[model samples]
Target chain A: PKPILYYDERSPPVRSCLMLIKLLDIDVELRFVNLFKGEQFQKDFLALNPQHSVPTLVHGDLVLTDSHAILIHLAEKFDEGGSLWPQEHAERMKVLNLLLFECSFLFRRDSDFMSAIVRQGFANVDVAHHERKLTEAYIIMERYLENSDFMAGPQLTLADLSIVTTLSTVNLMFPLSQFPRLRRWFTAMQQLDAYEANCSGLEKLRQTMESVGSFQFP
Target chain B: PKPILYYDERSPPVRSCLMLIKLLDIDVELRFVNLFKGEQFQKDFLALNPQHSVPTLVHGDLVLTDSHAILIHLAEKFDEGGSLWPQEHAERMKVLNLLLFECSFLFRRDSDFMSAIVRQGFANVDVAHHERKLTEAYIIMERYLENSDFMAGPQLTLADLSIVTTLSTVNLMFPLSQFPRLRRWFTAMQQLDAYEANCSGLEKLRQTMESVGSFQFPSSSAV
Candidate 1:
């Protein structure tokens, strides 16, 4: 298998994609591309993904960038049956729908909004605005968490994987203990065998950002 | 089945959910919340979907909002063995990834950014921005269209449904007659019995929008 995961441990997108690798038990080349250090911006790296994003997959001649897509791709190509991703149109789409929203609302802002106010170097007025939006997004999650076991359905779906990893990266930016459902989900996700394997190198990534002092502006 | 679709014909998200109705021959109740009369802004509607977005699904007691989520719910639960959405991770995830990109990059700009310009009684800039981004988006579409029969894979998955509906609305804002791949993909999408069954009212909805000039911006609630 010519699978190479082009990733940055710091980025939630990379974490989300890696969660799938752990889930499917598929072994591929894990290539780390540092976002802050501009590792992804290099010429050779950009060739696989013109957008220069993380969690790109290179399996043989095919190349894919975008974490959610990569997650679905790995689930589809590698898995023996329609186990994780789901085959049914209506039910699986339910998980996929929340998956997209998480990507759009939660994961996207995990870094943009939370982390900006997090580290001093990234602070700005826009960060404050994003923080407000991010707070509003959490309120939405708080409501959903009250009802569902996981975001998708009764069982563990990839949708859970999508949100958990992103939120974990968000944890790097700010404390998320306040959101109980998310916290519960995050804790359970970490315990899952898939998460433990993919997150093998997470402490190093965490130590890299421990310099950000812990103080909520609230 | 108690699968009731709380949707309006004009909304892209609603159309995206209609894909299931098209793919599988399940007859779910269609309750249209007329956007023209501001029916969607009601307290009851807001309670159903805190976000107050269109295309919510109510199956028995389970109520789900957000078009993307609703589509996925339908794809998995209703699917028998194998349907439009692929069973394999790589095949389907490829589509979901693109569909997710559509949510952030295309849908946001087309729905929000365009409203910030033209539809909300504002200056019309960002047309070039739309073109640039859509060019990037459609290039991928064009490539996939060239290689595969549909946008995501061999079959007409919800990925095609979502992107096609998104493109259909994009046509209203900016004519996509120029993009051959999107045009072709949309054409093939139209030929499908499932898409046609669900999209029966869409043409009239388009005509209404054309006549009324433009409607209110979709971002009435906070993002």
Candidate 2:
């Protein structure tokens, strides 16, 4: 039996997993849990993941709720070349460090902003504060990209895949013109064939935002 | 050159790393950074860690800021037996999953509550809200511990070490008598010799709390 991935495309974290699935070319069943329709709160979904978050991957008996963990599992198990997640201790540590930063800081701030927009229409959201926090995050990312072409190092890894999904969404709200390094890095990420997976969801997100209010950042 | 761990005992994340170092019995130079005195914000510390967070581990040329990452590095690099962090893919995933939970949910809520107390006096904090969030986290943890003896599995792993430090601090704010499984697990954790590292820091935190005001969990909303 193939693994099942519970996901919503518009979700940044879910898209991160989707991008990896595309990159790895793995055969996994895709199950959509629409957040806008409140399907994630239903009984069956809750049983699969008590946290009720999407990008929940069920491989055999093991179920993973966190996207970072899911990405690591997929990369470690499927990516035989060890490009996505390296095998060496030092290299793996660098990737894991960035992955944790994405989880704790980058994705976190993005989630808060998106959650606010989802919960209380775009008009009610605090655009300035969210932008400020995102700017701080972007500055850090810019600093990170200063020394290496990718988030973890010179080569692209799961860290870049995980971070790009969130950074791309954040770019829609807050422009990336200020950070040259990030813009350059994001452009490089966009050129990848696997990036096609992010396009439709991003378009859906943009359409959803346009229906409510214009992008607030300058 | 020996690795240097910049830490503050009052910080739960730092204590988690300290507990792991104790368990590994690795030789590391422990440098005390007084968070209360704004040492983390100092230029020297900032140079070491731009984020200026404690539990920063500098091993040779590699530097790690997050405690969870620090714990993983220590276990992977130093632990020959792979007992603390399993070598097998499936077992390691289970441990990693629980570790992420501790980072994203467990430690996050605890950090918010503690940051509130530190930034604003304990009297000014919204005790009820913090307790509510913490209770939700505890319920999740209790559910996780339902079948397994430890957080990740039968034996104690880095998941347990990483979580207990934060859970221990939360217990001081909100007693764990209501959580029988957590209490039982914490009791078992306390029996470990390495848990002694958590004692003095826990005491320091308790004294600091006493100086500010008493814990207001059960009767928080009423006040």
Candidate 3:
């Protein structure tokens, strides 16, 4: 039986899962959880994943939440080649570290910025605060992208896959052109066939963010 | 020669690294960085780690800046028995997912709460907002702790190590009373032999939080 992936397309982390599924050509069923309508709070879904977050993968008895965890699990459990997640210790460590970077630093800061808008209805003070935080994150990404072909190294690892999903969503709010190195890397990432599958969701998110045009100001 | 770990003891992430080092008995040189004095910004430190975050692990040419990165690297590279980090895919995936849980949810939420106090000087509004956030986080953790001896399983994994350190520091700010299973698990974690070394840093953090009398309240709501 194919593993079922519970996801919302509008979510960046969910897109990360989609990109990988397309990349690996996994014969998995994509079950939608309408987060805006609070489908995640429904009893059945809550029973399956208590956290009720999208990108939850259920393979028979096993349930895996956390997008990166699902990525690693899929790569290890399915991907025959050690391509998505490298087996080499050093390379693997770099991949795991960058995943952490996305979760703890990049994505965390982005959500905080978004949350302020959600709570306060978009003030300049909050927007500017978030902009500075994002710029700092961009500087770090730009610096890292300088020496490497991808986030982890020359080859596209799970790090690139995870981070690009985040950056792609964030780019809708903040343009990626300012960071030349990151722009180049992101452009390269866009060329990947797997990244091609991420478009519809990206568009969904873009439209959603644009609806907030009242609060967003350059 | 031993790998070098740049850390400040009071930092929870740094303590996670320290606890792992102690658990694995890795020969690592603990280099103190005066974060309060802005020593982390010094040129050499920046050169060593462009990220400039503590719990940076340096082993020859290899450098790791994230605490989980350092912990996983140590467990996988140095742990001879594979018990700390199980090799089985089913078991390992649970550990990995929990590690991501710590990174994405629990620890992230804790920092957000702390940042509010640090930035806004802790008004009733901000503290109440953060208290509500912690309560939500505790509910999820309490759910996870049910029917499990440890975070991932009955056996202690690196997931336990990472979350325990974060919880220990967070408990300093927010008590763990409401989550009995988590409370029981954490108490069991404190009984581990390596748990002794975690005290000094925890004490330092407790004293530091006490100094921030402006932010904290008696209960989670006020605190």
> Which numbered prediction scores highest in TM-score against the true structure?
3
Each candidate's TM vs. the true structure?
Answer: 0.73, 0.92, 0.94
- Give the winner by lDDT: 1 or 3: 3
Task: Name the best candidate (by lDDT).
Answer: 2
Q: Write the per-residue lDDT of candidate 2 for residues B120-218, one digit (tens) a residue.
A: 778888989998999888888888888688999989899999999888888877777667898889889999999988887977876776565544333
lDDT (Cα atoms) of all candidates against the true structure = 0.67, 0.85, 0.80
Q: What stretches of model 3 exceed 4 Å from their correct place?
A: A123-125, A212-218, B123-125, B212-223
Candidate 3 - CAPRI tier? medium
Full ranking by DockQ: 3, 2, 1
Which candidate, 1 or 3, has the higher TM-score?
Answer: 3
Q: What is the lDDT of residue A146 in candidate 1?
A: 71
Ranking by TM-score: 3, 2, 1
How many clashing pairs in candidate 2? 0
CAPRI-style docking class of model 2 based on DockQ: medium
* Evaluation by TM-score, superior candidate among 1 and 2: 2
Query: What clash pairs does model 2 have?
Result: none
Q: What share of the true interface contacts does candidate 2 keep?
A: 0.53
Between candidates 1 and 2, the one scoring higher on lDDT is 2
Candidate 2 ranges beyond 4 A from true positions? A120-125, A207-218, B207-223
Write out the backbone clash pairs for model 3.
B217-B223
